[PDB]
């Protein structure tokens, strides 16, 4: 059992080289049992296997990508990496790192992918990054319904996707309402995040939305205080 | 080498779902069936044409008829609503995903939208901007109509509305934003967002 984490999401310009890493925890990247794998999925489309690499140098690449891609290993950091040349809008996708394990002497293998990351969104665009403006959606008597009140954060005018929002550094999970982002006519995204909390907690409990926009290397912790 | 699946299978709860996958090398290459929900990494539900992994519900089964393999879900549940992908390989050793099949479980229990309308924040007005945020959650099915009014008059200028999408609770959510100048916000008596879902309307109103 290994844990795999892709590098952060963000922008790459058309005709440039996409580069991603996957950091492996729990075992050594140099072990030959592991077939270090990359998989991608363009938003709204299907899954595409890109290939795998073993530390010996053995490779198996998707034939349509084999002259554009390289998988490599960095032993010092216990990482493997993806390099994709001359990218276009066709290469916009969520990229997942994964691995497949063959043990010496096994005769029955069930899982094509034994362990996997949860993917990272690479946007191929010539547009420029923009960090979000974050505004509080304050709880009032107009956002309170009976025992429970709604409050939130407005994450305004950012590019590209994705943005993640937590509340009180992840400690508050109950009542967190997730919403898709809107794509505005200007090319920028906005999203909202709302948590419903007990109305009686508003005077004493501090509420903070933790906004992460990794493509711009921006994080915002916004205090949301009652009106 | 291409593994061909039907683009969509629309089925009401309780009916039997069958998803095929055809490829000329399947008589010599095992197939694997994957379930994907919410753009996450897919989960194996059937391996080697017919076998069921541990922890997978017994209602999932798989069969093989040479060039065509079939994933079958008896007693289809709302949770089984997902995208399904067959995985196999060509004779050269390239691993190949099928095109994917969207399993839609139509006819789930209806749910009325919860609507909350937020006015522009003081921080945003002090920054010389104004956005009204109409949030819509926990509704089913996913078709919804959103309209805005300034006082009692309809307004469409400055309105952006998301396409609704299912959230973690298997219910749909949506947002509509109305951008104004601070003086346009302060000059009107009120603004409203009207949310129509399955013929009935919910309207929330705010005032400066």
């Amino acid at each position: 059992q290994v844990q795999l984490q892709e590098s952060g999401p963000g922008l790459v310009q058309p005709s440039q080289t996409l580069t991603l890493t996957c950091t492996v925890s729990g075992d050594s990247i140099s072990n030959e049992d592991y077939h270090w794998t990359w998989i991608r999925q363009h938003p709204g489309k299907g899954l595409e296997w890109m290939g795998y690499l073993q530390y010996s140098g053995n490779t198996n690449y998707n034939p349509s990508l084999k002259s554009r891609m390289t998988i490599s290993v960095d032993t010092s950091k216990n990482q493997f990496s993806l390099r994709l040349n001359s990218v276009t809008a066709a290469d916009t996708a969520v990229y997942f790192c994964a691995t497949s394990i063959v043990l010496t002497g096994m005769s029955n293998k069930i899982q094509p992918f034994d362990y996997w990351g949860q993917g990272t969104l690479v946007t191929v665009s010539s547009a420029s990054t923009k960090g979000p403006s974050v505004f509080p959606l304050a709880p009032s008597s107009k956002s309170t319904s009976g025992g429970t009140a709604a409050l939130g954060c407005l994450v305004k005018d950012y590019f590209p996707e994705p943005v993640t929002v937590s509340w009180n550094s992840g400690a508050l999970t109950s009542g967190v309402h997730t919403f898709p982002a809107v794509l505005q006519s200007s090319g920028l995204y906005s999203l909202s995040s709302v948590v419903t909390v007990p109305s009686s907690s508003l005077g004493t409990q501090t509420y903070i939305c933790n906004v992460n926009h990794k493509p711009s290397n921006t994080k915002v912790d916004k205090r949301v205080e009652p009106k | 080498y291409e593994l061909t699946q039907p683009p969509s299978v629309s089925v009401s709860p309780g009916q039997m779902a069958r998803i095929t996958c055809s490829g000329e090398a399947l008589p010599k290459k095992y197939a694997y069936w994957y379930q994907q929900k919410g753009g996450q990494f897919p989960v194996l539900v059937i391996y080697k044409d017919t076998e069921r992994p541990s922890g997978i519900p017994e209602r999932f089964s798989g069969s093989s008829s040479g060039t065509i393999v079939t994933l079958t879900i008896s007693g289809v549940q709302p949770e089984d609503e997902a995208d399904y992908y067959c995985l196999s390989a060509d004779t050269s050793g390239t691993w190949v995903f099928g095109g994917g099949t969207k399993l839609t479980v139509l006819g789930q229990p209806k749910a009325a939208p919860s609507v909350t309308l937020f006015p522009p924040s003081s921080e945003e007005l002090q920054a010389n901007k104004a956005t009204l945020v109409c949030l819509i959650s926990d509704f089913y099915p996913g078709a919804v109509t959103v309209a805005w009014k300034a006082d009692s008059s309809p307004v469409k200028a400055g309105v952006e509305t998301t396409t609704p999408s299912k959230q973690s609770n298997n219910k749909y959510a949506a947002s509509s934003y109305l951008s104004l100048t601070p003086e346009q916000w302060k000059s009107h008596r009120s603004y409203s967002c009207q949310v129509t879902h399955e013929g009935s309307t919910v309207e929330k109103t705010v005032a400066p």
Binding site: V102, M106 | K28, Y30
Partner: peptide, 11 residues
């Protein structure tokens, strides 16, 4: 000897 494609796919 079986490689990963033998173990996974070859019938």
């Amino acid at each position: 000897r079986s490689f990963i494609e033998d173990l996974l796919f070859n019938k």
